[PDB]
Design a protein around this ligand. Sequence first.
Ligand SMILES: [K+]
Ligand SMILES: [Mg+2]
Ligand SMILES: [Mg+2]
Ligand SMILES: [Mg+2]
Ligand SMILES: [Mg+2]
Ligand SMILES: [Mg+2]
Ligand SMILES: [Mg+2]
Ligand SMILES: [Mg+2]
Ligand SMILES: [Mg+2]
Ligand SMILES: [Mg+2]
Ligand SMILES: [Mg+2]
Ligand SMILES: [Mg+2]
Ligand SMILES: [Mg+2]
Ligand SMILES: [Mg+2]
Ligand SMILES: [Mg+2]
Ligand SMILES: [Mg+2]
Ligand SMILES: [Mg+2]
Ligand SMILES: [Mg+2]
Ligand SMILES: [Mg+2]
Ligand SMILES: [Mg+2]
Ligand SMILES: [Mg+2]
Ligand SMILES: [Mg+2]
Ligand SMILES: [Mg+2]
Ligand SMILES: [Mg+2]
Ligand SMILES: [Mg+2]
Ligand code: NA
Ligand code: NA
Ligand code: NA
Ligand code: NA
Ligand code: NA
Lengths: 399, 151, 180, 220
Amino acid sequence: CKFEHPRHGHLGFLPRKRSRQIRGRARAFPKDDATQKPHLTSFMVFKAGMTHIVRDVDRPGSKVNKKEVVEPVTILEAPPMVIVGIVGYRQTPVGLKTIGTVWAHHTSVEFRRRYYKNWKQSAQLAFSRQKQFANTKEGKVAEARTLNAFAKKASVIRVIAHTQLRKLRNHRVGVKKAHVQEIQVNGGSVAAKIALAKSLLEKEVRVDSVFQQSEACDVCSVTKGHGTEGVVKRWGVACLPRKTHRGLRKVACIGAWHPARVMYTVARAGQHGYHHRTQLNKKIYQIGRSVAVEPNQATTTYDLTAKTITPMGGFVGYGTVRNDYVMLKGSVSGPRRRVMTLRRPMAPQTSRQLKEKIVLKFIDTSSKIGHGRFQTKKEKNQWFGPLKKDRIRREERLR
Amino acid sequence: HYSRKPQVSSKSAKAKVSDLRCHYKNTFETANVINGMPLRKAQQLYRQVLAKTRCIPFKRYNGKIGRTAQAKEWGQTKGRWPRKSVVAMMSLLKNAEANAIEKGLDPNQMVIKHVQVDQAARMRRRTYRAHGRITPYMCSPCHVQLFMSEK
Amino acid sequence: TRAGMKGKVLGKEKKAAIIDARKKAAESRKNRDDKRWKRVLANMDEEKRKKFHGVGNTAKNSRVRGATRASLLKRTGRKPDAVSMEATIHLSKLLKKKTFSKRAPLAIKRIKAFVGRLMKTKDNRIDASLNTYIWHKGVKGVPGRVRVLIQRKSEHKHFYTVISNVPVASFKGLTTKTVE
Amino acid sequence: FPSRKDAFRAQRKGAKKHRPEIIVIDLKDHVLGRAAAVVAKQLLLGKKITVVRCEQLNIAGTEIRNKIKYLQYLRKRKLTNPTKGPFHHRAPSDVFVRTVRSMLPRYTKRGMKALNSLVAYEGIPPNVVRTGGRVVIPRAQRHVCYRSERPYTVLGNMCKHVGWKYSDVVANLEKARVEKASRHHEKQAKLRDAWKSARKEALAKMPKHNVEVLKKFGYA
RNA sequence: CACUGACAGGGAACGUGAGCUGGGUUUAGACCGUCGUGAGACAGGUUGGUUUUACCCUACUUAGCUGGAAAUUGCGAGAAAAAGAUUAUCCGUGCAAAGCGGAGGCGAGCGGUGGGUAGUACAUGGUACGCUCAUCACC
RNA sequence: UUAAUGAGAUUCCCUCUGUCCCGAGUUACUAUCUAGCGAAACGACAGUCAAGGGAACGGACUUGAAGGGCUAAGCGGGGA
RNA sequence: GAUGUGGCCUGGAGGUUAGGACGAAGCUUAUGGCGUGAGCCUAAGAUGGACCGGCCUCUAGUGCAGAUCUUGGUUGGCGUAGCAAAGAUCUAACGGAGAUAUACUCAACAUGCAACGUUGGAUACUGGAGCGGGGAAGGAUUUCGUGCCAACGGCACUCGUA
RNA sequence: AAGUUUGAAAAGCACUUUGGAAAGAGAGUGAAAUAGAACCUGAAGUCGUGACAAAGACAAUGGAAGUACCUCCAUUUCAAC
Ligand SMILES: [K+]
Ligand SMILES: [Mg+2]
Ligand SMILES: [Mg+2]
Ligand SMILES: [Mg+2]
Ligand SMILES: [Mg+2]
Ligand SMILES: [Mg+2]
Ligand SMILES: [Mg+2]
Ligand SMILES: [Mg+2]
Ligand SMILES: [Mg+2]
Ligand SMILES: [Mg+2]
Ligand SMILES: [Mg+2]
Ligand SMILES: [Mg+2]
Ligand SMILES: [Mg+2]
Ligand SMILES: [Mg+2]
Ligand SMILES: [Mg+2]
Ligand SMILES: [Mg+2]
Ligand SMILES: [Mg+2]
Ligand SMILES: [Mg+2]
Ligand SMILES: [Mg+2]
Ligand SMILES: [Mg+2]
Ligand SMILES: [Mg+2]
Ligand SMILES: [Mg+2]
Ligand SMILES: [Mg+2]
Ligand SMILES: [Mg+2]
Ligand SMILES: [Mg+2]
Ligand code: NA
Ligand code: NA
Ligand code: NA
Ligand code: NA
Ligand code: NA
């Protein structure tokens, strides 16, 4: 008979436990349409940092129609992935079972370190017997039989892809063992999927071959961790009055007399953050090329200044974006340096917002350390001019 | 004098200490871990516990103690580094080694075969509580006996 | 280390042989790639040659693309028992947000740990000058940097270090040096 | 999946490939409760039973009556912690296993042994297809148990409407199984016909007194 | 009084005090009115008046280690596996077809790892590729 | 009835503010982990639930439903 | 609730019969046998060290599971709660058993840790209504020197109002 | 509160060995050091240790009937029996 308000938190994200993995993993793939061409559905990226952009909006009826807006964006570095294997799945009354794996003839050191805790001091025998066997005629026959089994019984075909940390030449991402994920091949018949996958073997796949610029994607990633947290932060319950004996930041009543136990719907202290999330409908604002190929990464048709996607001073705690990258509108779960998965969208992409063609007019590259007011180092140089240390440097130059 | 006997007494060395004045539970844990070890292996383990690179596994006297990664080699999660029990047991092992040397045995071959830690008679102190109450403050010393045999 | 890499299990000879085998494998890869990249770059055109940036170790102020930096390190050998070096320690990076009444004792412990890791010594003695310098602005006013003189000596063989203050007017431009 | 010790010991023993005495029941068009009762009593008698085609069990009444029964059962759940609550299984073979389990002393070791002697499948999986002639339970068949004017439900349809998601998989697999089995049966028709004609001619080749003996006991 | 789509009604030991708070109620102090000879009374008013303990079990929340299908044992053998001299005595394909196509040793084949050399490809230090000498295996 | 006085009871106004909207960030000391030291309260036996009956609100009983063992930090639903 | 019992049991007494250093009482038991049972009796002590059993009768402070029972001891909780006001110590040398304490390999780190008293130096606090210097009351050797660290100084001690 | 009640005699453990010491390991005395000093006997309860039995989660205990394994127990039988 009391005053009413909704409960705190979403019981569908239970338990608030630490995620089993640090990598974002797709728990489902888009519905497979056999009418389309065979195509990959996912890609692993690394979060570098955030900035903001200006664009004009194409949305008739809106008060911002034909008007500039500024959008925060997230930059995710996407070095190409390497396809090392093919797996097939057959459907049974108890769910999908993998038929087998067709391994590539050659694997990178980075892929093989994933099988070790201490690679440098190990014997480094991973895949050696497999190489010596598959190379022969009995091995060729076994591979042919596995491929024929894929053709005969598989309804689902996925590729085994791994990341290239040597190409992701990042100093703070300490890991050197490649990240491995199964990427599902959608489109076409099963034979067509197998042909695409077999062509992909031992090859590099670039993020622009999986995703196009103005499309949207879903992001699988794990959120930033906070360790043990109380109910106020973890659940959003109210703080108690100042007058409260023995503590304020808690739930006053954790239950009625009956049931004579505590329900699972009551907010408790515990792990907060480090949870897996799937975060659909992130618009791709840009798929950039690596700076060693195209250094004018942040240049647009309206801002002719030559600049890269890296802000002055670098991304804080991350460094330089050296590879291909993806500009996503808004935010994604997880901190910088964390590997994440971009998945082709599962929700229907027919709204005006999701179909809108994105054209960037300005990309902010000012310092992310302390109220950056210069877009480029040349702008700062022309503000300040000759400083004392530059004069000393020239004085040394003349002698 | 000991609850058990060596299989061969000419190839064994004994040592015991009574009313040790270490904590009985900690000494129980510290002495039990070396029960079937070679003497040198046990002495190295104690030296490394003093250096806190290895730990004493705490089984049965571990109610609400901390978890540590050094307890994994013993198949446990809970362990500690009880320096006082450790140094007392090092002294006891030195005495056992001396007894072995006197008997003409090689300490490099002796295997600890028997370790028993018991609760000795308790010493009484008192502590002062709220509302004028006096409440006990006891010390729990221990007896330790061991023998080792040539492999 | 693992059993197959333990010094007391393989012995000197086998440990050396396995080490040289790994090195010669890495070296064979490095030389093959060196020759291949040199000739592939040579027989390429100017548009492509400039398109390729510093692949074949062409660009200045770069690492050697062939191998690791530590593999290029010349291993002079055994350091002598008695050795002396002068080094700056960035104390403020270690003492940031530390409880004010603990700053100077913490600085002493951090200096001991720093030197002990540098010299493989657990007996690290603080000379009166260094303790006086660390404490000379009270407990919470430890200087952000200190230049210390480290003298290892011997007296099995027992190694210990004597750490003393080096008064400096400025810390700019000072790196780690060996003193005789 | 046997341990390496089991395989090594079998290799040492020189024993052959063994299979326990197992009865395979085809539950198509069987009354759910009556088949469950018969199977439970036989399991308490030590029999090893595999039941196939649990998706074609029947319950008396319209499908909606029995789907509503299932939904009533589904809402039973431990409110304070639904994990550890009643676990509601949607697959038809799971439903049959639960029905049999409720007809057993499941909280004794004897009842547990009996329940672990039962294997339930939807359709007829390939590991069962060739193990021998399957059996029916005459006292639990729909065509003698239900007056045919009454509506009845097929278990698989109800299950798929209450959450079972493998209906189409089992349907396609059963179609493939029947097609393969019918091809294998149309072939070998010549072998069966050859054996029939062989027996017919054996009659004219055997001694006559034996033929008369067969005649008086109804075999010739 | 006002906002709103609406400001519905109930239960949970009149849910919920080792969750709080303590305004009311309900001790001892004190004032009033009425009652009582009085001490005192009031179901009347008024003001002031200690809110104790969890480290046990369970529940719940997170967080580690770890056995186990005869739910620790039996050696007690059941695959949502294949399909054959009883799974042995080859590999592919094909419908569980009809058939069809490959399959004492030296040498050869096929490959794994090292030398020489030669383009090229891929995101461009690091792998693959053609030719030859070496070894290694399996045949 | 009363100026003055009041750690007396009450109402309103100005100022002011984390009292509140609605919470957030930082510190010391704890908790926490370690070394040394080391109690008490309490303790029939013990501890997963639903319903049912029952001294009319069961941890034990009837019928169902759960339940692999051992642990660290918390927490105040129950242990009437 | 009443009553019966050549019914059981315990400490003493009058009788009568025995036993014990070749081992009494007591105590221990997967230690059997007997009795419906209270209990009795044997065996074995790798227990003990000097008294004591049976039977008839007499006699009484004569039988325990519980009384918020009495006294002593033990015990889970538990290596738990905690030992958080009064800001604080650092460094070298000396002293000390208190160490630089090691199986093989091993140069030293990764295998003796943690803690002491004194002197010197550094740093800080008390801040004269003082952890200053003297008295009453109260206490009565706590004063001083040397020695010594079993117990005590809720951690420690080589130190101490021990 | 508290029997000094070791043992017939103190014969009260020389001497060796390692430990700073307390003590330990040996050796001696004694009929016996589980007679080693506030020491005869040395119970229950609780605890340590070795060997074994096993054992999910039915709190444990308990009844009744078997069975597996053990049994420092009893009794009987062992040939014209
Ligand atoms: K502690
Ligand atoms: Mg973090
Ligand atoms: Mg309060
Ligand atoms: Mg605690
Ligand atoms: Mg007190
Ligand atoms: Mg008092
Ligand atoms: Mg639901
Ligand atoms: Mg209260
Ligand atoms: Mg309160
Ligand atoms: Mg008051
Ligand atoms: Mg007043
Ligand atoms: Mg007043
Ligand atoms: Mg607030
Ligand atoms: Mg706590
Ligand atoms: Mg209930
Ligand atoms: Mg109860
Ligand atoms: Mg509670
Ligand atoms: Mg009666
Ligand atoms: Mg008497
Ligand atoms: Mg009496
Ligand atoms: Mg009674
Ligand atoms: Mg504590
Ligand atoms: Mg001062
Ligand atoms: Mg004073
Ligand atoms: Mg003390
Ligand atoms: Na009156
Ligand atoms: Na707990
Ligand atoms: Na009694
Ligand atoms: Na503390
Ligand atoms: Na004698």
